[PDB]
Design a protein around this nucleic acid. Structure first.
Ligand SMILES: [Zn+2]
Ligand SMILES: [Zn+2]
Lengths: 115, 114
DNA sequence: TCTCTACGTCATCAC
DNA sequence: GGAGACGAGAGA
């Protein structure tokens, strides 16, 4: 049977990672490798990777899991993105980890000068 | 036999003003009173009256006439609004002609600095 | 007769 | 543990 791409052992994949994000990765390995597999909210994607609404809203560009908004079911649904997708796009947009670091720098300077 | 609300004479109303904007106004009167009946583009409404996309996009707030964009039919459709509607909303938003001209004054000062 | 949205940055409120 | 305010470029 098909084996998890991290451990090469487990045959039972994490239902979310597999069904939503198309990753043959078991639940244990996903918890051991959050640098790849962690789920990030839409707000975390904007804050951490400087991605915009038009990017994150593009269904052709990212897989996403939706859930009820934890603050209230009447508020806009929560949107969860897999770190490895988010990061891969962000590194392309910004010029790798380095460029992203540059952009983070450039916005902190922003607020200092803006009081 | 219903008469134009400007002249009280003509019974043939301007098709656009009547059908689209629901105004019983003849075409001659519409050209004689542009302060009421002139059609303004979406761009002109933003420029002249400081209305936003959310305001002008609101189907329940303004009547509007759409035409093909005159630059190219592949561009987004032109949208025309009637001055008397747009102005009445702008006057409410900004506090009469007084307050609108103030906003003008303000916005203009704002870019002077920049 | 031009129109829409990317670019901001973030408070607010969605209930 | 998400969806409008002030103002060039591509094409709704
Ligand atoms: Zn595994
Ligand atoms: Zn008349």
């Amino acid at each position: 049977a098909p084996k998890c791409i991290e451990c090469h052992i487990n045959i039972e994949m994490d239902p979310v990672l597999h069904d939503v994000f198309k990753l043959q990765v078991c639940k244990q390995c996903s918890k051991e490798h959050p640098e790849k597999y962690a789920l990030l909210t839409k707000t975390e994607c904007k804050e951490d990777y400087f991605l915009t609404d038009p990017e994150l809203n593009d269904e052709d560009l990212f897989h996403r899991l939706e859930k009820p908004n934890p603050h209230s079911g009447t508020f806009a649904r929560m949107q969860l993105f897999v770190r490895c997708e988010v990061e891969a796009f962000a590194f392309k947009k910004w010029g790798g980890e380095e460029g992203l670091d540059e952009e983070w720098q450039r916005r902190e300077e922003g607020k200092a000068h803006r009081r």
